[PDB]
Amino acid sequence: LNEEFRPEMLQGKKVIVTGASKGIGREMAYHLAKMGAHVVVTARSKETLQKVVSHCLELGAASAHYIAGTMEDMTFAEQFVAQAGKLMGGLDMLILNHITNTSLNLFHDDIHHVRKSMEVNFLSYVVLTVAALPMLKQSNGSIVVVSSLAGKVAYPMVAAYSASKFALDGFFSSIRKEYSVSRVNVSITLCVLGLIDTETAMKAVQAAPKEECALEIIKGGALRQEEVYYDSSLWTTLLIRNPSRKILEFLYS
Amino acid sequence: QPLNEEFRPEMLQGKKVIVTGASKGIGREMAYHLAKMGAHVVVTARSKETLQKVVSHCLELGAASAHYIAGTMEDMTFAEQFVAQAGKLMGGLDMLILNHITNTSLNLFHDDIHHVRKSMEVNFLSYVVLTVAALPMLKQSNGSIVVVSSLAGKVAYPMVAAYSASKFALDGFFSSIRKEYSVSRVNVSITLCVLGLIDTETAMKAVSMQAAPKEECALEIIKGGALRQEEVYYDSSLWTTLLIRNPSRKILEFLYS
Amino acid sequence: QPLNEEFRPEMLQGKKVIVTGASKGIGREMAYHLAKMGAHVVVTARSKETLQKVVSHCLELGAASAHYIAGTMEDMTFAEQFVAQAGKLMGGLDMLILNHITNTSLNLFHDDIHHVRKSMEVNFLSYVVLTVAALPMLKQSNGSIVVVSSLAGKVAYPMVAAYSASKFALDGFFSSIRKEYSVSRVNVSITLCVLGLIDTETAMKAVMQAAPKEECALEIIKGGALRQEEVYYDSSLWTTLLIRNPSRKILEFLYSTSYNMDRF
Amino acid sequence: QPLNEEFRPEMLQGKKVIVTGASKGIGREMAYHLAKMGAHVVVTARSKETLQKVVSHCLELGAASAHYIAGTMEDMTFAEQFVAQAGKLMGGLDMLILNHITNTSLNLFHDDIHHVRKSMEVNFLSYVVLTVAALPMLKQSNGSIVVVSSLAGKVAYPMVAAYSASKFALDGFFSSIRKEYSVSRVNVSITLCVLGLIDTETAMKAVSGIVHMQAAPKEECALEIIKGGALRQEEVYYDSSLWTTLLIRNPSRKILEFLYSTSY
Ligand SMILES: NC(=O)c1ccc[n+]([C@@H]2O[C@H](COP(=O)([O-])OP(=O)(O)OC[C@H]3O[C@@H](n4cnc5c(N)ncnc54)[C@H](OP(=O)(O)O)[C@@H]3O)[C@@H](O)[C@H]2O)c1
Ligand SMILES: NC(=O)c1ccc[n+]([C@@H]2O[C@H](COP(=O)([O-])OP(=O)(O)OC[C@H]3O[C@@H](n4cnc5c(N)ncnc54)[C@H](OP(=O)(O)O)[C@@H]3O)[C@@H](O)[C@H]2O)c1
Ligand SMILES: NC(=O)c1ccc[n+]([C@@H]2O[C@H](COP(=O)([O-])OP(=O)(O)OC[C@H]3O[C@@H](n4cnc5c(N)ncnc54)[C@H](OP(=O)(O)O)[C@@H]3O)[C@@H](O)[C@H]2O)c1
Ligand SMILES: NC(=O)c1ccc[n+]([C@@H]2O[C@H](COP(=O)([O-])OP(=O)(O)OC[C@H]3O[C@@H](n4cnc5c(N)ncnc54)[C@H](OP(=O)(O)O)[C@@H]3O)[C@@H](O)[C@H]2O)c1
Ligand SMILES: CC(C)n1c(-c2ccc(OC(F)(F)F)cc2)nnc1C1(c2ccc(F)cc2)CC1
Ligand SMILES: CC(C)n1c(-c2ccc(OC(F)(F)F)cc2)nnc1C1(c2ccc(F)cc2)CC1
Ligand SMILES: CC(C)n1c(-c2ccc(OC(F)(F)F)cc2)nnc1C1(c2ccc(F)cc2)CC1
Ligand SMILES: CC(C)n1c(-c2ccc(OC(F)(F)F)cc2)nnc1C1(c2ccc(F)cc2)CC1
């Protein structure tokens, strides 16, 4: 779009946010709440989710519902979309944000962490996406994929994490192109985040604030942007872009 | 850093070397080369018939030793054991050349989670099991790991999303450890190879542009692996190859580090 | 700070404008496009004969006005006096287009230092002199300066050392002041035009896949019209994509903070 | 193509090296280093008094030989005689270090066309004259030309427009002669040095209170330059900030030159 962002773009939209119990996903739920969308939030914490929702109503959500689950269950994820699109009567925006817990750790031989990472952080995203597609095609809707610097560049202590984040990129970019000719009109937004000041991130480890981070993710999705960047450093963000890649893609088109 | 000297076919003398996806296409030609350098190879794949026909031609091209195992890298259990049996069969390891990948066709993605899944299993996880399983031998031998990849593992392209994802995943993975090794003084070479269109039998079947030949490619893979190079590009197009590098990134990494 | 909406031929109507080396090639074309949009126009070059034709034909196409002043930009006194006189004739200036260059052939460089100096004098120095003479009137109309350059003014190419040197100089000097005008809040914009091969009798008589001079010109004009920092034009979308330098914009705007200009 | 293999100080022992603007800053430091390595040296600049101190220290320090010849590079005759004289004093030449610049100061540009002419004369054209005069010797020793430039000679920057024009000017000129040497098969390396703020007296004098970036150490600066020369590299990047030094090279350019290279 040629636009500038304004809060009202979300008013009355039917939004899904995953990994919505804490951290950025919640912040996003709240932002959407403030902007009066319909929101369905998911994560494992039944009792925390209910509270996020109540808060969403007080903020002025078109409506807010929760479905508790774990994205390790591919079945749960197919059915979550089904159910969620029932509570809202459709879907404008799918925000894929959840991750499985990991640690800063040297990879010796922790294979089961790699596999899990790949299922939670990447496969569930494909599944949610697949289930969310006919309705997003309905609303000429949007898919938002939360990633990180570590999905663009190498870092140590997070091989499993990066593998999966790098994977989102490969798969959704390629999918983006696909839609960019089947003239399927769903946007796909890949968010690349630097350190954000989330409880989990801070207790695991300069940090950018989560509140503004969430909104920047929502802005990028509403503006149908291809990629969103966000980091405590401006130095950081300018650089994350990759010109050499754009040319190559267009060259090979 | 890529051990500073121009290539030499001798580097591959008595070097104990596995090649996966070594039954046909590029995988085969990588083996052949290694043989004509007097290295001990162990090739794997499925078709044991065609794999027999591969070990043979190896020896009579001067391979120190050439054995084979036949299995499916869908089988993580299998792969883990293939690396032991192989290390027992050669009494060591200097080069691990992961190169196999499941079968895919050119297609719009739309519904096939099965495929996305199979691909992440055989293209990516398998490679991570072999590696883990090869780590002790490689640690003693101060050797090399080579991961084959593609243009589609660096840039976006339609019709092959399952694929690109698996390949994008390797980079993210192996570059991540590469650096872990660096801050562990761990002495293992990690080499990722970016290959544009290569003329292989199976690859050419379902593309019906510019085809770079299998020969120089496998050669190229090895050079890089021995040469201890971080990555190795190779497309039929010089024009592309130097921007298909990614200076943008080399910075930030080295920057944050 | 480029524009906030796209280009209409009417933006030049009754705009006062100078075109240099407008006695042929891209220059002559810029002039025609301009008359054809009803701008006032002063064109210059050494040859009075040919300039006469440019001027007449220019009236034929709807030029608010059209006149010339013949001279060599080898002469800074001319350069200086030429702008005043053209400024007087029109009652102002909205856009300056620096486009002339000295004659040049393809040769390996050996010892001809005279050619290097003249290249710098005519291609680069004069442009500066003209800018100096024109800025007061340009400040007045918030107009634009357009500097016509070449790929060989961003990348290295044999057979054109002197030529290339001067074009490099142009980018160097004018990019610097552009940023300079930025923070002294001068509202004159500067557009630098990076051109591949264009099919001008001279270019062609000299030298590969020429883009048409006719279009080049309009774009040049459009570029300056739309107050863009750079215009690229070449008969190869491919090249025009390889032309930009992201790194450079990056560190320009990184180091964009290492200074305060208040002693001024 | 830089010499595949790594630098050793002895690469310079016995080598006949001219260094210009070698009475202060980087230039002095270059003389010194070369002195340590046992090189023959001929420095030059305007103030002979200070040039004498340098010549002393180089001799004490171990030069195989060391002179100065004083003079202003405003005078092309001199620049040209110099080389002849320096060649005379060493029986040939292996490396030419082009380094001097005219005194200049952080200022907005206004109407100082002279400053702009002097800069092109001193920081650019003299380099060319000196080079022309050396080529014939350098040819004989398969020697090297070393040109000292700035980041202001790769990216725009305000307050240094005349300076910047002339440094840009060097890039376009020496980068095009560089190619020319490849094709004509001339074997003299040409090394362009792209520096950030170096901690020289003058420099520090000049940017203090107006600019606040990190100055790199002039001693190390000096040696990077010689190795770059000795290794026959095309560019030497040197800044305190290893960020900077990394995104400074332009690969689009290397590409574009390559395209239009082997495909004329
Ligand atoms: N924080 C940063 O510095 C940073 C940097 C770059 C990228 N990111 C991206 O930001 C996103 C979340 O960031 P964050 O830092 O805010 O993380 P976070 O606060 O810890 O929250 C992750 C969310 O996922 C839910 N979750 C965890 N395991 C799950 C599972 N198995 N199934 C379903 N839901 C699960 C968690 O809730 P439950 O435990 O209740 O299930 C939580 O709501 C991630 O995609 C991450 O990659 C963050
Ligand atoms: N060809 C190209 O243009 C191209 C381009 C970019 C990247 N690459 C990379 O080049 C590498 C080799 O590609 P290629 O074109 O040479 O492929 P190929 O000729 O079709 O060979 C695939 C190999 O993998 C083996 N394989 C197939 N399924 C397997 C399984 N389930 N478990 C274990 N091994 C299996 C095959 O042997 P069996 O079927 O008998 O088991 C065969 O040896 C691939 O990693 C690809 O990523 C190729
Ligand atoms: N055409 C290309 O392939 C190409 C490529 C890249 C950049 N460009 C740029 O585009 C611009 C125009 O090029 P062009 O091809 O149109 O050139 P052109 O047709 O030969 O025009 C040169 C103009 O400058 C004038 N001129 C020559 N010497 C002069 C002097 N000493 N003092 C004042 N004016 C003088 C000429 O008229 P008189 O001789 O009668 O005075 C003529 O009008 C130049 O800046 C060039 O660098 C062109
Ligand atoms: N230092 C930095 O922050 C920095 C940054 C980027 C690039 N550079 C480049 O590094 C090189 C050396 O810089 P620097 O900082 O060392 O400067 P500097 O200390 O001021 O060196 C100037 C030298 O040039 C000589 N010189 C001045 N005018 C001359 C003239 N008209 N004719 C002949 N020689 C003349 C000076 O001696 P006399 O006056 O007695 O002749 C002195 O030897 C320059 O090319 C500069 O562009 C420096
Ligand atoms: C390490 C952390 C800051 N990070 C990042 C991240 C990775 C690399 C970064 O810098 C660079 F890319 F340059 F390495 C910056 C942020 N992405 N997700 C994360 C999080 C994380 C990842 C893994 C982990 F074990 C603990 C936390 C989610 C916080
Ligand atoms: C599609 C093909 C050319 N390709 C590629 C590839 C190379 C360059 C490409 O261009 C671009 F750079 F844009 F990605 C795209 C894909 N990488 N592996 C492949 C192969 C392939 C992958 C998937 C498939 F279904 C059929 C073939 C392995 C031959
Ligand atoms: C040499 C010619 C092609 N050229 C160019 C030019 C443009 C792009 C070029 O390619 C590359 F990008 F590689 F520099 C090379 C030269 N710019 N002005 C010119 C002209 C020219 C300059 C010098 C000369 F001797 C003869 C003609 C002005 C016509
Ligand atoms: C301005 C200064 C830092 N500088 C530079 C320079 C280096 C990096 C710069 O940063 C960037 F280019 F990125 F803006 C800018 C200018 N190059 N030569 C210089 C010097 C200089 C040039 C001109 C002047 F007026 C005063 C000092 C020789 C010291």
PDB file of C-alpha atoms in Angstrom, chain C residues 120-258:
ATOM      1  CA  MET C 120      38.315  19.595 -15.267  1.00  0.00           C
ATOM      2  CA  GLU C 121      37.905  23.238 -16.328  1.00  0.00           C
ATOM      3  CA  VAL C 122      35.017  22.760 -18.783  1.00  0.00           C
ATOM      4  CA  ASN C 123      33.188  19.688 -17.417  1.00  0.00           C
ATOM      5  CA  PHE C 124      33.560  20.488 -13.741  1.00  0.00           C
ATOM      6  CA  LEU C 125      34.902  23.905 -12.870  1.00  0.00           C
ATOM      7  CA  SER C 126      32.514  25.805 -15.098  1.00  0.00           C
ATOM      8  CA  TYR C 127      29.560  23.905 -13.622  1.00  0.00           C
ATOM      9  CA  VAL C 128      30.626  25.314 -10.264  1.00  0.00           C
ATOM     10  CA  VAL C 129      31.134  28.842 -11.493  1.00  0.00           C
ATOM     11  CA  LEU C 130      27.683  28.711 -13.165  1.00  0.00           C
ATOM     12  CA  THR C 131      26.149  27.432  -9.987  1.00  0.00           C
ATOM     13  CA  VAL C 132      27.705  30.260  -8.042  1.00  0.00           C
ATOM     14  CA  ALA C 133      26.381  32.840 -10.485  1.00  0.00           C
ATOM     15  CA  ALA C 134      22.926  31.279 -10.426  1.00  0.00           C
ATOM     16  CA  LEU C 135      22.289  30.429  -6.803  1.00  0.00           C
ATOM     17  CA  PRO C 136      21.024  33.877  -5.711  1.00  0.00           C
ATOM     18  CA  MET C 137      18.269  33.732  -8.338  1.00  0.00           C
ATOM     19  CA  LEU C 138      17.710  30.054  -7.596  1.00  0.00           C
ATOM     20  CA  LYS C 139      17.348  30.669  -3.864  1.00  0.00           C
ATOM     21  CA  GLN C 140      14.749  33.204  -4.994  1.00  0.00           C
ATOM     22  CA  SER C 141      12.527  30.791  -6.974  1.00  0.00           C
ATOM     23  CA  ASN C 142      13.366  27.667  -4.960  1.00  0.00           C
ATOM     24  CA  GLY C 143      14.462  26.225  -8.270  1.00  0.00           C
ATOM     25  CA  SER C 144      16.652  23.325  -9.209  1.00  0.00           C
ATOM     26  CA  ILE C 145      20.135  22.519 -10.390  1.00  0.00           C
ATOM     27  CA  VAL C 146      20.533  19.552 -12.685  1.00  0.00           C
ATOM     28  CA  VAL C 147      23.931  18.070 -13.315  1.00  0.00           C
ATOM     29  CA  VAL C 148      24.327  15.685 -16.164  1.00  0.00           C
ATOM     30  CA  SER C 149      26.696  12.805 -15.554  1.00  0.00           C
ATOM     31  CA  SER C 150      27.605   9.264 -16.665  1.00  0.00           C
ATOM     32  CA  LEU C 151      27.972   5.706 -15.413  1.00  0.00           C
ATOM     33  CA  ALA C 152      31.652   6.416 -15.906  1.00  0.00           C
ATOM     34  CA  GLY C 153      30.999   9.015 -13.227  1.00  0.00           C
ATOM     35  CA  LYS C 154      30.250   6.244 -10.717  1.00  0.00           C
ATOM     36  CA  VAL C 155      32.344   3.318 -11.921  1.00  0.00           C
ATOM     37  CA  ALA C 156      35.729   2.946 -13.574  1.00  0.00           C
ATOM     38  CA  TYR C 157      36.080   2.435 -17.293  1.00  0.00           C
ATOM     39  CA  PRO C 158      39.138   2.521 -19.555  1.00  0.00           C
ATOM     40  CA  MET C 159      39.615   4.893 -22.470  1.00  0.00           C
ATOM     41  CA  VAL C 160      38.019   7.749 -20.492  1.00  0.00           C
ATOM     42  CA  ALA C 161      40.322   8.687 -17.590  1.00  0.00           C
ATOM     43  CA  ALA C 162      40.219  12.498 -17.888  1.00  0.00           C
ATOM     44  CA  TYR C 163      36.540  12.402 -18.787  1.00  0.00           C
ATOM     45  CA  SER C 164      35.679  10.071 -15.910  1.00  0.00           C
ATOM     46  CA  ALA C 165      37.765  12.043 -13.451  1.00  0.00           C
ATOM     47  CA  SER C 166      35.705  15.185 -14.007  1.00  0.00           C
ATOM     48  CA  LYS C 167      32.362  13.402 -13.745  1.00  0.00           C
ATOM     49  CA  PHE C 168      33.447  11.821 -10.495  1.00  0.00           C
ATOM     50  CA  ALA C 169      34.354  15.351  -9.369  1.00  0.00           C
ATOM     51  CA  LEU C 170      30.808  16.479 -10.139  1.00  0.00           C
ATOM     52  CA  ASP C 171      29.276  13.852  -7.849  1.00  0.00           C
ATOM     53  CA  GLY C 172      31.856  14.627  -5.228  1.00  0.00           C
ATOM     54  CA  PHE C 173      31.315  18.390  -5.209  1.00  0.00           C
ATOM     55  CA  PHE C 174      27.531  18.544  -5.713  1.00  0.00           C
ATOM     56  CA  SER C 175      26.594  15.691  -3.366  1.00  0.00           C
ATOM     57  CA  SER C 176      28.609  17.471  -0.709  1.00  0.00           C
ATOM     58  CA  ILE C 177      26.856  20.840  -1.098  1.00  0.00           C
ATOM     59  CA  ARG C 178      23.481  19.164  -1.515  1.00  0.00           C
ATOM     60  CA  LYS C 179      23.922  17.939   2.042  1.00  0.00           C
ATOM     61  CA  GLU C 180      25.343  21.374   2.770  1.00  0.00           C
ATOM     62  CA  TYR C 181      22.160  23.072   1.494  1.00  0.00           C
ATOM     63  CA  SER C 182      20.182  20.552   3.526  1.00  0.00           C
ATOM     64  CA  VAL C 183      21.283  22.012   6.846  1.00  0.00           C
ATOM     65  CA  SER C 184      21.595  25.679   5.878  1.00  0.00           C
ATOM     66  CA  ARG C 185      17.995  25.190   4.702  1.00  0.00           C
ATOM     67  CA  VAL C 186      18.606  26.357   1.131  1.00  0.00           C
ATOM     68  CA  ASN C 187      15.626  25.219  -0.931  1.00  0.00           C
ATOM     69  CA  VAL C 188      17.423  24.665  -4.199  1.00  0.00           C
ATOM     70  CA  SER C 189      17.435  21.043  -5.173  1.00  0.00           C
ATOM     71  CA  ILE C 190      20.220  19.293  -6.976  1.00  0.00           C
ATOM     72  CA  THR C 191      19.756  16.343  -9.316  1.00  0.00           C
ATOM     73  CA  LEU C 192      22.659  14.295 -10.642  1.00  0.00           C
ATOM     74  CA  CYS C 193      22.025  12.379 -13.843  1.00  0.00           C
ATOM     75  CA  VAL C 194      23.759   9.060 -14.375  1.00  0.00           C
ATOM     76  CA  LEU C 195      23.482   8.164 -18.011  1.00  0.00           C
ATOM     77  CA  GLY C 196      24.534   5.167 -19.976  1.00  0.00           C
ATOM     78  CA  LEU C 197      25.118   5.340 -23.714  1.00  0.00           C
ATOM     79  CA  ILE C 198      22.620   7.663 -25.418  1.00  0.00           C
ATOM     80  CA  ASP C 199      22.209   7.732 -29.223  1.00  0.00           C
ATOM     81  CA  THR C 200      23.679  11.185 -29.917  1.00  0.00           C
ATOM     82  CA  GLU C 201      25.533  11.708 -33.171  1.00  0.00           C
ATOM     83  CA  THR C 202      28.591  12.544 -31.101  1.00  0.00           C
ATOM     84  CA  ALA C 203      28.407   9.655 -28.638  1.00  0.00           C
ATOM     85  CA  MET C 204      27.887   7.281 -31.527  1.00  0.00           C
ATOM     86  CA  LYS C 205      30.654   8.836 -33.655  1.00  0.00           C
ATOM     87  CA  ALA C 206      32.979   8.217 -30.702  1.00  0.00           C
ATOM     88  CA  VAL C 207      32.572   4.673 -29.416  1.00  0.00           C
ATOM     89  CA  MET C 208      27.085  -0.889 -26.167  1.00  0.00           C
ATOM     90  CA  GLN C 209      23.310  -0.448 -26.725  1.00  0.00           C
ATOM     91  CA  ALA C 210      22.194   3.196 -26.926  1.00  0.00           C
ATOM     92  CA  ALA C 211      19.032   4.443 -25.265  1.00  0.00           C
ATOM     93  CA  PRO C 212      17.187   7.152 -27.237  1.00  0.00           C
ATOM     94  CA  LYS C 213      18.329  10.733 -26.662  1.00  0.00           C
ATOM     95  CA  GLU C 214      14.727  11.877 -26.849  1.00  0.00           C
ATOM     96  CA  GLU C 215      13.722   9.986 -23.690  1.00  0.00           C
ATOM     97  CA  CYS C 216      16.914  10.557 -21.781  1.00  0.00           C
ATOM     98  CA  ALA C 217      16.141  14.263 -21.954  1.00  0.00           C
ATOM     99  CA  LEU C 218      12.572  14.111 -20.733  1.00  0.00           C
ATOM    100  CA  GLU C 219      13.641  11.981 -17.825  1.00  0.00           C
ATOM    101  CA  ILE C 220      16.499  14.319 -17.021  1.00  0.00           C
ATOM    102  CA  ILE C 221      13.938  17.128 -17.005  1.00  0.00           C
ATOM    103  CA  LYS C 222      11.492  14.999 -15.019  1.00  0.00           C
ATOM    104  CA  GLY C 223      14.202  14.187 -12.496  1.00  0.00           C
ATOM    105  CA  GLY C 224      14.984  17.841 -11.858  1.00  0.00           C
ATOM    106  CA  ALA C 225      11.279  18.642 -11.980  1.00  0.00           C
ATOM    107  CA  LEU C 226      10.547  16.079  -9.255  1.00  0.00           C
ATOM    108  CA  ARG C 227      13.563  17.305  -7.239  1.00  0.00           C
ATOM    109  CA  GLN C 228      15.172  13.846  -7.008  1.00  0.00           C
ATOM    110  CA  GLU C 229      18.678  13.435  -5.635  1.00  0.00           C
ATOM    111  CA  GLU C 230      19.574  11.085  -8.561  1.00  0.00           C
ATOM    112  CA  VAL C 231      18.207  10.079 -11.943  1.00  0.00           C
ATOM    113  CA  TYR C 232      19.547   6.943 -13.625  1.00  0.00           C
ATOM    114  CA  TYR C 233      18.860   6.198 -17.234  1.00  0.00           C
ATOM    115  CA  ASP C 234      20.241   3.506 -19.447  1.00  0.00           C
ATOM    116  CA  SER C 235      18.899   1.098 -22.032  1.00  0.00           C
ATOM    117  CA  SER C 236      19.101  -1.777 -19.573  1.00  0.00           C
ATOM    118  CA  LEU C 237      16.802  -2.079 -16.573  1.00  0.00           C
ATOM    119  CA  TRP C 238      19.455  -4.489 -15.287  1.00  0.00           C
ATOM    120  CA  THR C 239      22.185  -1.862 -15.135  1.00  0.00           C
ATOM    121  CA  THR C 240      19.845   0.780 -13.730  1.00  0.00           C
ATOM    122  CA  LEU C 241      19.368  -1.565 -10.766  1.00  0.00           C
ATOM    123  CA  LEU C 242      23.077  -2.067 -10.196  1.00  0.00           C
ATOM    124  CA  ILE C 243      23.620   1.668 -10.237  1.00  0.00           C
ATOM    125  CA  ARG C 244      22.412   2.576  -6.757  1.00  0.00           C
ATOM    126  CA  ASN C 245      24.741   2.277  -3.777  1.00  0.00           C
ATOM    127  CA  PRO C 246      22.975   1.372  -0.503  1.00  0.00           C
ATOM    128  CA  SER C 247      26.194   1.183   1.507  1.00  0.00           C
ATOM    129  CA  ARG C 248      26.925   4.838   0.630  1.00  0.00           C
ATOM    130  CA  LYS C 249      23.505   6.135   1.659  1.00  0.00           C
ATOM    131  CA  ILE C 250      24.007   4.143   4.855  1.00  0.00           C
ATOM    132  CA  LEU C 251      27.327   5.615   6.022  1.00  0.00           C
ATOM    133  CA  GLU C 252      26.387   9.021   4.700  1.00  0.00           C
ATOM    134  CA  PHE C 253      23.474   9.033   7.073  1.00  0.00           C
ATOM    135  CA  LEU C 254      25.378   7.293   9.825  1.00  0.00           C
ATOM    136  CA  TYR C 255      28.103   9.934   9.841  1.00  0.00           C
ATOM    137  CA  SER C 256      25.202  12.344   9.290  1.00  0.00           C
ATOM    138  CA  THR C 257      25.413  13.128  13.024  1.00  0.00           C
ATOM    139  CA  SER C 258      29.128  13.717  13.596  1.00  0.00           C
TER     140      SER C 258
END
